[PDB]
Design a binder for this molecule. Structure first.
Ligand code: 6LU
Ligand code: ZN
Length: 257
């Protein structure tokens, strides 16, 4: 099955998922001098006050924190978006070294990691339907650089020992995702795809300008997760990122100047 290794990684994915070579694939490089300020872009509306976290899971490709999305509790609106998108899950992509790990890049610069807050358009009723639509998902992408610790990340870091291997999960209630956001909601936006198989072209990408800082100890604990399951030889979960894909016939827009 697909993964991030030499024999099953991003260069192989197109054989099972031919849309890998499609017209709106993610991630991309954000060339900051070529992105155009769009004064008609509204401010983002991130309404996470009522967010209800559920469980944290190692799925063998990342770890994911899930949310109750059966009501409008944690929603993303505004920006380039029409309508209301419910928070389903967040997860990360990260590197083996601090100079790599993000999926999007900024003027070819790679960050140590990238947070994806995944939301789906409620007019499609459920996330499975939404993934089949060009405006079905909105993913808020946030870069991580290594420096000062991010206090709002620490409860995530604390529990990773209990989900070390593929297939493990733990009860992760009462987590506040607002503690993962930077100060500014300035953003770039473009139409794209899921960055993991099936690579569906269903995502409005919203990538924040301002990275969050995390400590070396925090990201080191990401790197101690395992791709393997329990009772298998250890393979460290690192470098779970897809590289930048051709921009093709797309323009990246900026909410700021
Ligand atoms: C928790 C959950 C439940 C269900 C029914 C579906 C999903 N699927 C999902 O979140 N897919 C997805 C894959 C890749 C990205 S990325 N890496 O482009 O942000 C986002 C969502 C996730
Ligand atoms: Zn992702």
């Amino acid at each position: 099955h697909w993964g991030y290794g030499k024999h099953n990684g991003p260069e192989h994915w197109h054989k099972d998922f031919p849309i890998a070579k499609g017209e709106r694939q993610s991630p991309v490089d954000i060339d900051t001098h070529t992105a155009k300020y769009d004064p008609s872009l509204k401010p983002l509306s991130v309404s996470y006050d009522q967010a209800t976290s559920l469980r944290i899971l190692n799925n063998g490709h990342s770890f994911q924190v899930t949310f109750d999305d059966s009501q409008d509790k944690a929603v993303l609106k505004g920006g380039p978006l029409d309508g209301t998108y419910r928070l389903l899950q967040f997860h990360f992509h990260w590197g083996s070294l601090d100079g790599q790990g993000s999926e999007h890049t900024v003027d070819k610069k790679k960050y140590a990691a990238e947070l994806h807050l995944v939301h789906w358009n409620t007019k499609y009723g459920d996330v499975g339907k939404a993934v089949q639509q060009p405006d079905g998902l909105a993913v808020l992408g946030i870069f991580l650089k290594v420096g000062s610790a991010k206090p709002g990340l620490q409860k995530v870091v604390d529990v990773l020992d209990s989900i070390k291997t593929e297939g493990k999960s733990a009860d992760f209630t009462n987590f506040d995702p607002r503690g993962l956001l930077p100060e500014s909601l300035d953003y770039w936006t473009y139409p794209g795809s899921l960055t993991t198989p099936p690579l569906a072209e269903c995502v409005t990408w919203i990538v924040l300008k301002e990275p969050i800082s995390v400590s070396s100890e925090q990201v080191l604990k990401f790197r101690k997760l395992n791709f393997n399951g329990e009772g298998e030889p250890e393979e460290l979960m690192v470098d779970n990122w897809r590289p930048a894909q051709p921009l093709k016939n797309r323009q990246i827009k900026a909410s700021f100047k």
